[PDB]
Amino acid sequence: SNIIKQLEQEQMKQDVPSFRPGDTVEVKVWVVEGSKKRLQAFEGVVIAIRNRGLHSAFTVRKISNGEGVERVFQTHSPVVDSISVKRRGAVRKAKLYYLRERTGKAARIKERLN
Amino acid sequence: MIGLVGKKVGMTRIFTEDGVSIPVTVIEVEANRVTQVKDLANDGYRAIQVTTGAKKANRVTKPEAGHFAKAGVEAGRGLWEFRLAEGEEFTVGQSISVELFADVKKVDVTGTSKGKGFAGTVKRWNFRTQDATHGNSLSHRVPGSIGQNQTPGKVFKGKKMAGQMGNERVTVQSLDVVRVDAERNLLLVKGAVPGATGSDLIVKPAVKA
Amino acid sequence: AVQQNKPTRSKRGMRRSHDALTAVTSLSVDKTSGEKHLRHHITADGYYRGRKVIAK
Amino acid sequence: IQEQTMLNVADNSGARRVMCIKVLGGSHRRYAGVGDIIKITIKEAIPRGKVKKGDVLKAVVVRTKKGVRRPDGSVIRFDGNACVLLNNNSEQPIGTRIFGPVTRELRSEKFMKIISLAPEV
Amino acid sequence: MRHRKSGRQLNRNSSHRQAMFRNMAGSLVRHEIIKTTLPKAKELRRVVEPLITLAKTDSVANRRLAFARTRDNEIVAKLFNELGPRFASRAGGYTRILKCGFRAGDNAPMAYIELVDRSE
RNA sequence: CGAUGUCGGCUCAUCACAUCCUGGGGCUGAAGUAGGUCCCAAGGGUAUGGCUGUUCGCCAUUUAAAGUGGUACGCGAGCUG
RNA sequence: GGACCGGAGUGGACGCAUCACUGGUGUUCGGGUUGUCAUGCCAAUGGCACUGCCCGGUAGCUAAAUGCGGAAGAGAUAAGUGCUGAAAGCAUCUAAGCACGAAACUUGCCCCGAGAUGAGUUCUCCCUGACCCUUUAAGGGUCCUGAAGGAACGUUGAAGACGACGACGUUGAUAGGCCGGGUGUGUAAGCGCAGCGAUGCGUUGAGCUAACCGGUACUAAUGAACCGUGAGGCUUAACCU
């Protein structure tokens, strides 16, 4: 009856920050190369979806040496621990899948009121 | 110490939603009991059958109500019969036996299927469609040839053509390791709970498959 | 796409074994006005179960 | 990736565009785009590269637009398909330096040299 | 196949379905009674009573939304003046489907669809 | 001859084993990896392309393998010309 | 140079299931915009132009996504290798006996499956009233009673071409609606401020939002009525006749 929709809430991460699409975000990702376990930094413009439970993720595009790399990170996965919103961007669309294609272009900055 | 399984798998199964089921004990107090005990007189084999769920006790038919009415009237929704081991007596041992080392190794899975209607010959078995533009008068997704001219003179019995797919049963096995927990020292039983409700029961000897 | 022998009157009337009209086999009598109607239908004078649902 | 796929090259010795002529490993293997070996020809080359136009040799796919799925469900998608040129018999990289990002699934057997020469893993 | 799917396409296209439904909602709100077919009646209530529950809160924005649907200012005026507060205490179910006899020109299951009004 | 539509391809196949691979043996100029021949075995699997309409054939490259035949040289009230 | 035998993982092709993820589609969700017409006009909306062109996108379906699987075993064996052994005082795998031996056979695994007319078994439920003609286990008609259950009819479904098969039918969450959420689009209209104006800023992550999730009788699921009976043949064998 009043039971369901809580098994996905047992393993949430309530320490996540809130971000809009268009900001350049920093994602620290645990990686295993052997006995040691280090961190990886991923920067770039986020093309996010909002919280579909555990099944929520955000798409980040970075350009290393000429071509873009898109990485979608599952929000509540244990390998993603910390997100920093960093510079906050102003765009109209929820999905920046076409503005990500163009080169040398950066979105405008808006820091006051989200 | 010596002690093993008997007429026991479990008493509680919860409605299917996803099919992975990482376990956590939830706090809600309900009562469940074995109601079904068969009669003794007119049979040469002594068989026992299980049930699950709950019915309204208004749409239960009087034959089914009388079936459930032997030792307490609590009805369910389904019935499944199995073989003979010995009989029916109380075999309850002492308090605490099996906490030492031998918990679990694996589990098994069981399922059923979904109705896709009068499916086509490309949907049902993975047929190849002919080329849609180089000519192809009305033969893009049609079945092609179904036989071999005169000396058969007929189409064979196990032939793949268009019909209803779905509304059948399926069965699979062998789920694996997903994650471990060690630091908090909790008692764990492991496995994805098997498929949709409507399963046939797992009555098995030691692990063969 | 055509026959080679004429099908018989037996086979012709035997294909029509399932082509028979089934009846309603029961009507319902409205408590207010004693006329009969279909199940879950207006009594063709403006009555459902207990009220005159149609003024016309 | 598939047969008749135009691909860029990461290594310096491999020169500009290469095209996949056969998808190695398997009978009717259609699509192999993560760390698999593919037979290529060179469709357009610069004279600075050691290889020349029309030379058949092997490659390994390094970047793909389809993208590899991580175990947690993460997908790393690269814009444009890339390969690193290898010898036909020894299956070792001809190119001295690797350009661009590489993925951590290119760690098995002879590709430790590729990820060691590569900047970003 | 279709699973978990809503909306009956009524053997006609999307633009015609929307136009039929605007005209039907206007006719229901005007005359308080409609004789129509049974699937048309079911989809008719499924698109009419959202308007009546929009019409409880009298605002210019809600008049403009209730004018983006059904496109008749007499209908928006009735729906916010007389309907609305007449159905303010109700929580859903502003329509009633009573089935009548089959149509003469074609065997159509016909149905009177009407509100929960009173005569006087 | 008061009409049995002719190749190849596509789609779909089925059978025989005079067996391509996988399986079990013998012999060998079988030291091992690798081969050759013969016996048993038809359960399953048994390529993508450049050339011209091709069955064929040449070639690039792959695969453990790219079998030989019958089925109106299978299949036009299934398609192509 | 390079091992059979025996284990461990990881792939290609194939098949099944699923929609948790990655995606695709989503003409019924939202937004940007061109041309034009209309709502009296400004504003705001709607209609046509492939859904006007696009941009995203819920459910459902889906693969390119994910989970699994073809085994291990057992019996009888083909080729072959054998033991004991005479016929044929030696020999010999065979004639009497016996033991191995493969993806083939029969089971093992998974589906249909008592129309298996050889129509099977188990549990439960329901019916234990009269009269005439009797061309006689006889068999027909009349009155009463017509159960268990089914069918019909409405609400319908992740079931479906139609049937069928599930769920519900007022001691009711079955379907719509309504309420709250979630998702999706992306700061609605109105008003105010700045600017000559386009437009920008605040109200404001605003407003709309489906098929989704939890709750609710507001609407439709009415009570009849229909079918189905009234103890179920003859012989033979076990407790009194």
From Swiss-Prot, chain B:
One of its GO terms (biological process) is ribosomal large subunit assembly. PROSITE patterns: RIBOSOMAL_L3. GO terms for molecular function: rRNA binding; structural constituent of ribosome. It holds the Pfam family Ribosomal_L3. The keyword Ribosomal protein applies. It comes from the Bacteria. Methylated by PrmB. GO terms for cellular component: cytoplasm; cytosol; cytosolic large ribosomal subunit. The modification N6-succinyllysine is found at residue 38. The modification N5-methylglutamine is found at residue 150. Belongs to the universal ribosomal protein uL3 family. NCBIfam families: L3_bact (TIGR03625). Part of the 50S ribosomal subunit. Forms a cluster with proteins L14 and L19. In pull-down experiments interacts with CedA. One of two assembly initiator proteins, it binds directly near the 3'-end of the 23S rRNA, where it nucleates assembly of the 50S subunit. This is Large ribosomal subunit protein uL3. It comes from Escherichia coli (strain K12).
